[PDB]
Design a protein around this ligand. Structure first.
Ligand SMILES: [Ca+2]
Ligand SMILES: [Ca+2]
Lengths: 527, 203
């Protein structure tokens, strides 16, 4: 999920701006529910995740808001020491304790269409549910959420954010939210604010928080930090905040999940776009979203490194000279501006092959044995920090490759990508253009349970929010534009007829068009 | 179009988005649940079943493992009621109103199922049940908990153990520190050090 808030001083119009982009996948019916709420003293338009009695992406009369997943450290695993003589006992605070055993009965629709009962047994300890049990090593793993039992207080916090009329009230609501999100605020007086909300445990200083905590009683949480210690800022001096699930602040840690907060981080696309402009407007924010949605994210750090290496050798290799020219000219995107079904820059197909080759040469030998767990780290969708450090010769804890080896990888990866393209496509970059990848709004969301029938309409894949709002907080009211694909209404009639509003926002979404953000009733009545 | 539904005026725009004009929050939140049910009843039903671990009742044995995980990690109705009872009374009442609005659509649709119950309920041969405020909390939990819940500590333990077996502890520790670092000081941050001053560190 991405977000931006622009303060007065960075805004072309002098009005604070807000951009929303929650990434909750692409499903039909959609993951979002758009609504307008109007009662005396409360006027709000926007969307929330389906089922929520509150708006998350939009604006009330006083403020605009959005959120992105925090990736803060609110789940800990405890390593329970089991009794060798009884694997349902674990050692805790000086004595063997009995696990709580539970059996649940599931009514199941059989393949014959009739009911069938299945029972399953699970265990809990003082720390939480047991998620993994290994009797032969006398260990079990249990799970603790810092927010256990406070989910309804988090709902109330979000409703209070909806009812808030100023930053004091919004911050009060933020302080009550117990799960890990980033919240963003913009008001009609030019102010912006950012909060990394959540209830964060005070952990033992004797443990490494990237690994499970011993469950024997010496290393329990010692309470929760005060909200004032949560990362937050009102009107940061640079005049904006951008986020794409990246780190809130320099010394904020997240334990086992640090793999998302490295030197190479996809939020760079948003930083670059804001830093390259002087004052910005909503049209600029949309251009930045477009860039981020189509960028080959490895370009930011890896394209300069590739170009530098090829330039070193280009006087003896005209293929390297050609690639340098083509890489420098390329705008780093995999886009299809002429709607021909092929990505426009042929060198992007080269760069993709080069990257795949390079990642494999860096890590196949050393990490093949753990690839099922490490490929998602070293080729992570948010960045490839370790690969960058190894290839650039920056400090690492382990010497994965020498400097000579790193250079050789960059070159061999180039040669192999060239050879493949020459054999399968041709000599010139225009011949290398790859067919676009497409996506559909399917039946099954991140909750991993089908919730409808989906859609088969194919659209170009985009690394983009499931909805977007672009909001300018003018002195009189919020204004702007948005899209909430696939459409408002998930109803399909028993005869197969889709609602007229089932997928009537898909073309807008695919074609970078929007509908007006409606706030004044006179406008709503004409919409 | 513009219609009155009980005491609330609902304007649906050209995209079908409902704009609710109510005289107070109690009426507003009932209408909010009602329009969401009009638009998304089967989706709501299945999201709730996800949190309850009752998906397999509809979609069969291939969802039992998912349902097991949900009951294992979830809360009973009474535990959720205890959560609701700890809210401000007005907030609890508005969540109750939202559930009443979903229920009002359920009741209407069960009375006219051929026109008001979507195809999935016909294909799978069941009716939606009425909703309580605890079920609204379940709709929140089924999605919001996903962004918070992970077992990466256990994956990390497995990475380290396998690296130790392959390369020895000394080398495995260094490799692990490069895979999952304690704090990458160069990682881009939403708040920059120069965006504000922490007085206590002295400027
Ligand atoms: Ca943790
Ligand atoms: Ca094209």
């Amino acid at each position: 999920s991405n977000a931006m808030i622009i303060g007065a001083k960075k805004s072309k119009s002098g009005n604070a701006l807000l951009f929303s982009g929650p990434q909750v996948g692409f499903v039909a019916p959609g993951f979002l529910y758009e609504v307008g709420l109007h009662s005396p003293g409360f006027d709000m338009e926007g969307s929330g995740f389906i089922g929520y009695p509150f708006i998350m992406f939009g604006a009330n009369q006083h403020l605009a808001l959005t959120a992105t997943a925090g990736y803060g450290n609110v789940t800990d695993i405890f390593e329970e020491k089991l009794n060798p003589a009884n694997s349902t006992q674990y050692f805790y605070k000086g004595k063997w304790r009995n696990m709580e055993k539970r059996t649940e009965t599931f009514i199941v629709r059989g393949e014959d269409g009739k009911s069938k009962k299945i029972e399953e047994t699970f265990f809990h300890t003082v720390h939480g549910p047991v998620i993994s049990l290994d009797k032969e090593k006398n260990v079990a793993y249990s799970k603790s959420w810092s927010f256990r039992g406070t989910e309804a207080k988090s709902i109330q916090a979000y409703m209070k954010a909806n009812w808030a009329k100023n930053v004091k009230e919004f911050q009060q609501a933020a302080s009550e939210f117990t799960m890990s999100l980033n919240w963003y605020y913009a008001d009609k007086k030019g102010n912006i604010a950012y909060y990394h909300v959540g209830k964060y445990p005070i952990r033992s200083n004797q443990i490494d928080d990237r690994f499970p905590t011993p469950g024997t009683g010496e290393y329990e949480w010692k309470g929760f930090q005060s909200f004032a210690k949560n990362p937050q800022a009102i009107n940061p001096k640079k005049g904006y905040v951008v986020n794409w699930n990246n780190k809130p602040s320099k010394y904020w840690r997240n334990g086992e999940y640090s793999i998302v907060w490295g030197k190479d981080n996809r939020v760079q696309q948003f930083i670059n776009g804001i830093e390259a402009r002087g004052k910005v407007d909503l049209k600029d924010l949309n251009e930045i979203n477009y860039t981020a949605s189509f960028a080959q994210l490895r370009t930011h750090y890896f394209k300069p490194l590739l170009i530098k290496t090829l330039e070193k050798y280009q006087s003896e290799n005209k293929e390297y000279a050609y690639l340098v020219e083509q890489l420098r000219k390329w705008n780093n995107l995999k886009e299809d501006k002429n709607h021909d079904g092929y990505y426009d820059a042929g060198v992007a197909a080269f760069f993709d092959e080069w990257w795949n080759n390079t990642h494999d040469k860096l890590f196949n030998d050393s990490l093949g044995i753990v690839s099922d767990l490490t490929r998602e780290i070293t080729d992570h969708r948010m960045g490839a920090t370790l690969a960058y450090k190894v290839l650039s010769g920056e400090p690492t804890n382990y010497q994965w490759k020498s400097k000579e080896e790193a250079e050789k990888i960059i070159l061999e990866s180039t040669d192999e990508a060239l050879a493949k393209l020459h054999k399968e496509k041709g000599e010139e970059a225009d011949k290398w253009r790859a067919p676009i990848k497409t996506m559909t709004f399917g039946a099954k969301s991140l909750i991993a349970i089908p919730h409808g029938y989906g859609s088969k309409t194919e659209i170009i894949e985009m690394n983009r929010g499931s909805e977007n709002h672009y909001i300018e907080m003018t002195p009189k009211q919020p204004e702007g534009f948005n899209v909430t694909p696939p459409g408002q209404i998930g109803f399909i009639h028993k005869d197969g007829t889709l609602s007229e509003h089932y997928e009537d926002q898909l073309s807008l979404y695919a074609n970078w068009k929007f509908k007006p953000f409606l706030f004044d009733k006179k406008d709503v009545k004409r919409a | 179009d513009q219609k009155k539904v009980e005491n609330v005026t609902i304007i649906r725009d050209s995209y079908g988005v409902p704009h609710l004009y109510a005289k107070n929050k109690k009426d507003l939140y009932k209408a909010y649940g009602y329009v969401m049910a009009q638009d998304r009843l089967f989706q709501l039903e299945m999201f709730r079943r996800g949190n309850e671990g009752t998906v397999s009742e509809i979609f069969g044995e291939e969802y039992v493992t998912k349902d097991e995980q949900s009951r294992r990690d979830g809360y009973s109705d009474q535990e959720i009621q205890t959560m609701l009872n700890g809210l401000d009374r007005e907030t609890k009442q508005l969540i109750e109103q939202f559930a009443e609005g979903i229920t009002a659509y359920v009741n209407e649709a069960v009375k006219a199922p051929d026109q008001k119950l979507s195809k999935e309920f016909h294909d799978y041969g069941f009716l939606p049940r009425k909703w309580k405020a605890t079920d609204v909390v379940r709709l929140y939990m089924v999605s919001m908990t996903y962004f918070m819940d992970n077992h990466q500590e256990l994956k990390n333990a497995e990475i380290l153990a396998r690296l130790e077996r392959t390369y020895g502890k000394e080398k495995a520790v260094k490799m692990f520190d490069d895979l999952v670092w304690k704090n990458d000081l160069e990682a881009p941050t939403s708040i920059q050090p120069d965006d504000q001053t922490d007085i206590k560190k002295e400027g």
